Amino acid sequence: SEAVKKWVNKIIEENIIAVFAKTECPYCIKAISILKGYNLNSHMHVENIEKNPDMANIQAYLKELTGKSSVPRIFINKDVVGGCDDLVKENDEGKLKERLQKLGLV
Ligand SMILES: [Cl-]
Ligand SMILES: [Cl-]
Ligand SMILES: [Cs+]
Ligand SMILES: [Cs+]
Numbered sequence: 693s694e695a696v697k698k699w700v701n702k703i704i705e706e707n708i709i710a711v712f713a714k715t716e717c718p719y720c721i722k723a724i725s726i727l728k729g730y731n732l733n734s735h736m737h738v739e740n741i742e743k744n745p746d747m748a749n750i751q752a753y754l755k756e757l758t759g760k761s762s763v764p765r766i767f768i769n770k771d772v773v774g775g776c777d778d779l780v781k782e783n784d785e786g787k788l789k790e791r792l793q794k795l796g797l798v
Contacts, residue, residue: 696749700757704767707737708795712754712765714742719776720764726779727766730788730798769795 704710709732713720724738741750741763755761758772766773768791773779782788792798 696746700753708735708769710767711738712741712763714763723764723776723779
């Protein structure tokens with residue numbers, strides 16, 4: 693499905709911070725909260741892919757892009773951050789702040 697791929701692409705391309713999530717997922721909530729803690733909401737988009745008729749196709753494409761089909765899936769300026777654990781590693785080790793500094797976001 694070219695349509696699903698184009699739709700995922702547009703979310704990733706038109707939002708500097710793009711997070712694919714689902715309903716009631718604690719690691720989604722945690723990752724989104726960490727990012728909003730950097731005052732990123734203005735350049736953030738969160739897409740709930742569970743409330744979507746094509747959830748499986750979206751997940752398969754996110755796996756083609758990142759190696760995993762699980763949510764949350766996190767992109768920053770089209771670069772793959774990964775999941776919440778990856779975000780936590782980047783945050784604790786200073787990489788997340790460096791990332792955001794280079795984008796003018798902090
Ligand atoms: Cl990953
Ligand atoms: Cl992961
Ligand atoms: Cs912070
Ligand atoms: Cs937003």
